[PDB]
Amino acid sequence: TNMLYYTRGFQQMGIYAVMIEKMILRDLCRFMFVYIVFLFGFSTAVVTLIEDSYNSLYSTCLELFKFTIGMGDLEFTENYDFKAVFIILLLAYVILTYILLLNMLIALMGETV
Amino acid sequence: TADISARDSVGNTVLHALVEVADNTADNTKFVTSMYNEILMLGAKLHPTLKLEELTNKKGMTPLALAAGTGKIGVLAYILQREIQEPECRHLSRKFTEWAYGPVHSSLYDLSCIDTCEKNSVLEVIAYSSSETPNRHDMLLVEPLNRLLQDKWDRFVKRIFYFNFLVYCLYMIIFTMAAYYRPVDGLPPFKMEKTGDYFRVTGEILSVLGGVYFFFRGIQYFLQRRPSMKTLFVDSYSEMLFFLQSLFMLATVVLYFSHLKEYVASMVFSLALGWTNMLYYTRGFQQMGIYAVMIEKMILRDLCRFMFVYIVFLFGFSTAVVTLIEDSYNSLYSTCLELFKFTIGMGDLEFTENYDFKAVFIILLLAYVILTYILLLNMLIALMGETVNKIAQESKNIWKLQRAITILDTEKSFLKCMRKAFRSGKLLQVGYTPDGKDDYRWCFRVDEVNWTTWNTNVGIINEDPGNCEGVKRTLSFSLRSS
Amino acid sequence: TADISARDSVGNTVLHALVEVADNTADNTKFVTSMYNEILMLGAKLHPTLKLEELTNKKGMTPLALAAGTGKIGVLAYILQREIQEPECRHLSRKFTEWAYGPVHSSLYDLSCIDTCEKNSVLEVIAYSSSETPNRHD
Numbered sequence A: 001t002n003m004l005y006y007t008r009g010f011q012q013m014g015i016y017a018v019m020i021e022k023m024i025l026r027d028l029c030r031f032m033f034v035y036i037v038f039l040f041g042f043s044t045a046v047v048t049l050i051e052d053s054y055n056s057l058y059s060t061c062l063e064l065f066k067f068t069i070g071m072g073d074l075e076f077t078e079n080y081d082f083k084a085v086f087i088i089l090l091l092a093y094v095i096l097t098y099i100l101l102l103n104m105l106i107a108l109m110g111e112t113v
Numbered sequence B: 001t002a003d004i005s006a007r008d009s010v011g012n013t014v015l016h017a018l019v020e021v022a023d024n025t026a027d028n029t030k031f032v033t034s035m036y037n038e039i040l041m042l043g044a045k046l047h048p049t050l051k052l053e054e055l056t057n058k059k060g061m062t063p064l065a066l067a068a069g070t071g072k073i074g075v076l077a078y079i080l081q082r083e084i085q086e087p088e089c090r091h092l093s094r095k096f097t098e099w100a101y102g103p104v105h106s107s108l109y110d111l112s113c114i115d116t117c118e119k120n121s122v123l124e125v126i127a128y129s130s131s132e133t134p135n136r137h138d139m140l141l142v143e144p145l146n147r148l149l150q151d152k153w154d155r156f157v158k159r160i161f162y163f164n165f166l167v168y169c170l171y172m173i174i175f176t177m178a179a180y181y182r183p184v185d186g187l188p189p190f191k192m193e194k195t196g197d198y199f200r201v202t203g204e205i206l207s208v209l210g211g212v213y214f215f216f217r218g219i220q221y222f223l224q225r226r227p228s229m230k231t232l233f234v235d236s237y238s239e240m241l242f243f244l245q246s247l248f249m250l251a252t253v254v255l256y257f258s259h260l261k262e263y264v265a266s267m268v269f270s271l272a273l274g275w276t277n278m279l280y281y282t283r284g285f286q287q288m289g290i291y292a293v294m295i296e297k298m299i300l301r302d303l304c305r306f307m308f309v310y311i312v313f314l315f316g317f318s319t320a321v322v323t324l325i326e327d328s329y330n331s332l333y334s335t336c337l338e339l340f341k342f343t344i345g346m347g348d349l350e351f352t353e354n355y356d357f358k359a360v361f362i363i364l365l366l367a368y369v370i371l372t373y374i375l376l377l378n379m380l381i382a383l384m385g386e387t388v389n390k391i392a393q394e395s396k397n398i399w400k401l402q403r404a405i406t407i408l409d410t411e412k413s414f415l416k417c418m419r420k421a422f423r424s425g426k427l428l429q430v431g432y433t434p435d436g437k438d439d440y441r442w443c444f445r446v447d448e449v450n451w452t453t454w455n456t457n458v459g460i461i462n463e464d465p466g467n468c469e470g471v472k473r474t475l476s477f478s479l480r481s482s
Numbered sequence C: 001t002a003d004i005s006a007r008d009s010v011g012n013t014v015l016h017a018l019v020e021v022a023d024n025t026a027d028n029t030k031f032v033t034s035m036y037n038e039i040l041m042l043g044a045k046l047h048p049t050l051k052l053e054e055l056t057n058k059k060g061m062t063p064l065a066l067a068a069g070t071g072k073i074g075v076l077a078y079i080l081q082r083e084i085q086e087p088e089c090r091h092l093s094r095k096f097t098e099w100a101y102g103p104v105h106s107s108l109y110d111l112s113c114i115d116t117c118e119k120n121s122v123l124e125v126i127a128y129s130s131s132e133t134p135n136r137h138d
């Protein structure tokens, strides 16, 4: 990653790496606060609902990060008792994080660039 | 002779009527502010002991509050930055100068009827305005209202707001462990056995207390304001989601004592709402607050437009798929659920062989994952970019109004706690009243610099000989004489 | 007669004080650069053997380095592109012309106190500036 330092001998790659700096600081840090709040938020709500495996806070936070990277199973458990609750809660998650907040990030970057 | 002080059927005096007639256009604003001056100046020549602007109509509204309640930013800007240089009409000024040493000059803005005043504060009338009320978001950009709130922020509200964020975080850490470590055997309520099971009850009791707390704060918000059905759903998006969190909490209590497992169904919603509602407390921070305003706007214009058309397409092709399926994914849920996997990048184009026509099945899914995934999601990104380009300043000025409502509620929550609001100002002698007495006013200082109007033989400077705060000044025997 | 060379409590001469007072607005920049010229030109009429700009305050800063350490781009632009056409105040110029054959003209910019100089180079003071230091990038 620190070869991106040496993109500053080159005007187009150096400016490219300055934009990477600014994106990390304004666009992505604003993003990752709200994303980790949502993630940890619905994560607790999911593992609370799960009963005995994905009855852990890591594996639920880890499965809920698979959605943003496009690897989210909406049926990674049957070990619950309420299915409307489980899917209303994940649909709430993959709308406010995937549909909204990632595509919003792209919009913010364009404003930034 | 006409009566400057006389009132109409609705109680509006002439100056009130200069406010009702304003329409936020430049030529009207150029005029009304000119004519607002002249009668207001004339009322010092004739009837020199009245103070017209203190006159209240049938609705108890002054011309300033009526300009702020009705969205009249040009008149508001005039009334607030009003500086009159004439001697016998100087007391009617409102933007004073306390010293001018070179390009620097320290202005004083009166704070009569802006701070937590008696009847209608300009901040309250702006902050607690109905949603139509044009230029809710621009009326606070009128100086000194930014600086005055940013003064209240940096002096007492910032340290209180961050304590509110802390006590809410702890509350969320405690309702989360009390929920993570819930009983998974037997029916509720659940007796206590061990010490670890004692700690959670302290976390469960204490967790219901906040729900009772956030429940009444939503009843207070209802009866302290009486918002219409419209205003209730269109600008109160926070109070809805803390009150709603509170309802799932009490339902979680009603069901935990009614012997029903559905307490979990409400208890997890109250968590997910609760953590999402930390995005409320991004409004103590300019960059995170503006970020969360954009989230609001995206949900309302971009995503709601999106999710209509997406659910129409989804349910549309879904019915077309399950109709084609024969005996499993022969259900409308599992087909709507599999067709939502495409947008999240988890769509199998072969999640059934239980059909009879394969061209039909795949032409119909390709139709779906072109018009939804390729088109309509990537179109959403395009719409957001169009949105972000436009709401950049609008989101900064919804943020300052969000922060303002927090400043006011913080003041209004602590009439008893500390003492009131720390008064956000100082009682200064601006001059003398036209009857010779002292004109002491609660005034806000704003140092300003000017590299063009060098000479400016002001005279209207109220305490030049001491040229600052320092210690008490001379009052400058110029224009004042009493 | 006032002393062009005299210093204040913080060591700032008049020209240093023309830098402290600049605020990166056009009317201030229009002025300070005008007034920076006149005293700087006056100091060649009276006291013709001084070089005011070499004077260093308590913090060892010249008016040029103080303009660069404090973010004063308009004054910096003035001091660096400074060309004075008057004969007895030409040595105080800093942007010269070495030839002009038709539309072409070859300018010379002095590099005193910009290159790796002794005390404070304008490049170092700009490059190694604190982060507030307005207009680091301009």
Ligand SMILES: CCCCCCCCCCCCCCCCCC(=O)OC[C@H](COP(=O)(O)O[C@@H]1[C@H](O)[C@H](O)[C@@H](O)[C@H](O)[C@H]1O)OC(=O)CCCCCCCCCCCCCCCCC
Pocket: A088, A089, A092, A096, B136, B234, B235, B236, B237, B238, B239, B240, B241, B244, B269, B270, B272, B273, B276, B277, B278, B279, B280, B281, B292, B295, B296, B297, B299, B300, B398, B401, B402, B405
């Ligand atoms: C048939 C169904 C019946 C339903 C009836 C009941 C409905 C109740 C909810 C209604 C709302 C549901 C969500 C969609 C609406 C948008 C939400 C959102 O962004 O509003 C931003 C809000 C802003 O505040 P404010 O109000 O102070 O701002 C106002 C406001 O800008 C105003 O324009 C200004 O003029 C004024 O000056 C200013 O002051 O900010 C927060 O509320 C903090 C952040 C909160 C998080 C935001 C993200 C989304 C939250 C919702 C999803 C929750 C996820 C868990 C769900 C679990 C169960 C499935």
Ligand SMILES: CCCCCCCC/C=C/CCCCCCCC(=O)O[C@@H](COC(=O)CCCCCCCCCCCCCCC)COP(=O)([O-])OCC[N+](C)(C)C
Pocket: A003, A006, A007, A009, A010, A011, A012, A013
């Ligand atoms: C032993 C082997 C080691 C590996 C091989 C490498 C060995 C070390 C290599 C050293 C030499 C470095 C490359 C020099 C290229 C010519 C310079 C030139 O004219 O560039 C031009 C553009 O060219 C580019 O922009 C090219 C891409 C820039 C990114 C870095 C490429 C480095 C290549 C290797 C990557 C290796 C990655 C790591 C691999 C482990 C000019 O630049 P410009 O855009 O005009 O901007 C200049 C500024 N200015 C215009 C304002 C004046």
Ligand SMILES: CCCCCCCC/C=C/CCCCCCCC(=O)O[C@@H](COC(=O)CCCCCCCCCCCCCCC)COP(=O)([O-])OCC[N+](C)(C)C
Pocket: A033, A034, A036, A037, A039, A040, A041, A044, A056, A057, A058, A061, B172, B173, B176, B177, B180
């Ligand atoms: C920056 C990180 C990015 C990556 C992570 C992304 C996620 C966010 C990271 C968050 C960091 C904290 C992780 C959890 C706490 C540590 C573990 C622990 O003891 O948990 C306990 C608390 O049980 C709960 O249910 C959690 C209660 C709240 C704890 C976190 C507070 C908020 C942190 C910030 C939250 C974000 C929102 C606010 C900030 C924006 C129990 O759960 P457990 O872990 O199973 O413990 C073992 C239990 N066992 C014995 C039964 C097995």
Ligand SMILES: CCCCCCCC/C=C/CCCCCCCC(=O)O[C@@H](COC(=O)CCCCCCCCCCCCCCC)COP(=O)([O-])OCC[N+](C)(C)C
Pocket: A024, A032, A036, A039, A055, A056, A057, A058, A059, A061, A062, A065
């Ligand atoms: C400049 C930008 C680029 C650089 C970025 C630099 C790095 C950026 C990233 C940083 C994140 C680093 C996190 C810590 C390391 C991984 C977690 C770990 O150790 O798990 C271990 C323990 O973990 C636990 O016990 C944690 C319990 C709370 C869960 C919350 C964190 C979930 C991790 C994921 C959140 C993803 C969030 C993604 C978005 C933030 C493994 O758990 P386990 O033992 O197998 O099971 C125990 C389960 N139980 C104890 C909960 C019951």
Ligand SMILES: CCCCCCCC/C=C/CCCCCCCC(=O)O[C@@H](COC(=O)CCCCCCCCCCCCCCC)COP(=O)([O-])OCC[N+](C)(C)C
Pocket: A080, A081, A082, A083, A084, A085, A086, A088, B244, B265, B269, B273
């Ligand atoms: C943003 C502000 C806050 C919003 C709050 C939102 C929450 C408000 C809602 C609250 C109510 C939530 C449900 C309560 C429990 C019902 C029972 C249940 O879940 O499962 C039961 C039935 O499981 C089923 O799947 C059958 C259908 C159940 C009811 C579905 C209602 C849908 C309402 C849609 C409302 C949309 C609301 C949209 C909101 C935007 C139990 O069975 P199971 O064993 O779990 O099932 C597995 C077996 N199976 C495979 C055969 C199914």
Ligand SMILES: CCCCCCCC/C=C/CCCCCCCC(=O)O[C@@H](COC(=O)CCCCCCCCCCCCCCC)COP(=O)([O-])OCC[N+](C)(C)C
Pocket: A083, A084, A087, A088, A091, A092, A095, A096, B299, B307, B311, B314, B330, B331, B332, B333, B334, B336, B337, B340
């Ligand atoms: C602020 C914004 C962020 C927050 C938003 C918060 C809300 C976010 C979301 C909100 C949506 C919540 C939907 C209700 C709850 C889940 C459904 C349910 O209970 O299913 C149960 C029953 O379900 C049925 O029987 C439904 C039959 C009609 C299918 C259409 C809905 C498919 C659900 C998905 C649509 C995804 C659409 C995604 C895009 C919208 C489970 O079904 P089953 O018993 O196993 O099988 C029965 C099948 N059969 C009866 C049909 C034959």
Ligand SMILES: CCCCCCCC/C=C/CCCCCCCC(=O)O[C@@H](COC(=O)CCCCCCCCCCCCCCC)COP(=O)([O-])OCC[N+](C)(C)C
Pocket: A033, B150, B162, B163, B165, B166, B169, B170, B172, B173, B278, B281, B282, B284, B285, B286, B287, B288
């Ligand atoms: C017991 C433990 C509980 C957990 C820990 C937390 C305890 C509670 C913590 C309370 C204190 C709150 C943080 C104060 C930081 C310093 C203030 C400051 O100067 O900020 C600067 C920026 O700084 C930021 O923008 C930082 C990120 C803002 C988002 C919220 C971070 C909260 C940290 C914790 C997250 C926890 C999440 C939930 C975890 C469960 C200034 O702000 P600005 O951008 O200049 O805008 C200001 C407006 N103005 C400029 C117009 C005037």
Ligand SMILES: CCCCCCCC/C=C/CCCCCCCC(=O)O[C@@H](COC(=O)CCCCCCCCCCCCCCC)COP(=O)([O-])OCC[N+](C)(C)C
Pocket: B307, B308, B309, B311, B312, B314, B315, B316, B319, B331, B332, B333, B336
């Ligand atoms: C907002 C929600 C977001 C999440 C959901 C996303 C999807 C959209 C949600 C839509 C809500 C309605 C779901 C289906 C109806 C309820 C269930 C039912 O009885 O269905 C019956 C109707 O059979 C059909 O084929 C459906 C006919 C049309 C019904 C819906 C009308 C339009 C709703 C709006 C449509 C969107 C367009 C307009 C709005 C933009 C039969 O189907 P079933 O369910 O299997 O019933 C049991 C049958 N069984 C006995 C054989 C097992």
Ligand SMILES: CCCCCCCC/C=C/CCCCCCCC(=O)O[C@@H](COC(=O)CCCCCCCCCCCCCCC)COP(=O)([O-])OCC[N+](C)(C)C
Pocket: B355, B356, B357, B358, B359, B360, B361, B363
């Ligand atoms: C936007 C406005 C409206 C548009 C309306 C569009 C619709 C107009 C179209 C209408 C015609 C649709 C097909 C009719 C039925 C044919 C038979 C069939 O489905 O399966 C048969 C053959 O299955 C096959 O897969 C073999 C090929 C079948 C014919 C393919 C024609 C492609 C035409 C492309 C036209 C592109 C049109 C693009 C339009 C934009 C039966 O076999 P099976 O058992 O089902 O197959 C499984 C066994 N296998 C694995 C060996 C295969």
Ligand SMILES: CCCCCCCC/C=C\CCCCCCCC(=O)O[C@@H](COC(=O)CCCCCCCCCCCCCCC)COP(=O)([O-])OCC[N+](C)(C)C
Pocket: B170, B173, B174, B177, B178, B181, B182, B183, B194, B195, B196, B197, B198, B199, B200, B201, B203
């Ligand atoms: C910087 C902020 C973010 C990071 C930190 C986040 C917080 C710390 C991070 C992670 C938490 C790690 C796990 C905690 C212990 C496990 C649960 C337990 O013992 O009690 C119960 C739940 O627990 C509660 O309701 C809370 C009290 C726990 C007991 C110990 C005192 C903690 C005080 C905390 C004061 C509040 C928080 C602090 C602020 C005042 C367990 O209930 P049970 O039904 O008996 O279940 C059996 C469980 N057992 C078998 C494992 C025993």
Ligand SMILES: CCCCCCCC/C=C\CCCCCCCC(=O)O[C@@H](COC(=O)CCCCCCCCCCCCCCC)COP(=O)([O-])OCC[N+](C)(C)C
Pocket: B163, B164, B165, B167, B168, B170, B171, B174, B199, B200, B202, B203, B206, B207, B209, B210, B211, B212, B213, B216, B217, B238, B239, B242, B280
């Ligand atoms: C085992 C564990 C050991 C460790 C324990 C650790 C304990 C940790 C601490 C707290 C745990 C939870 C206690 C209750 C508080 C809930 C959270 C809360 O109030 O947040 C508020 C802060 O609140 C304050 O700043 C004042 C503190 C609350 C006072 C009233 C408590 C409720 C009692 C019953 C009262 C019934 C009658 C109600 C009227 C009095 C949130 O701030 P706000 O300004 O309100 O803004 C949000 C609202 N709005 C966004 C909609 C505008």
Ligand SMILES: CCCCCCCCCCCCC
Pocket: B175, B178, B179, B203, B204, B205, B207, B208, B252, B253, B254, B256, B257, B263, B267
């Ligand atoms: C995890 C928070 C509490 C979940 C259970 C709610 C029902 C009430 C429990 C304690 C009793 C309160 C009066």
Ligand code: NA
Pocket: A069, A070, A071, B344, B345, B346
């Ligand atoms: Na994928």
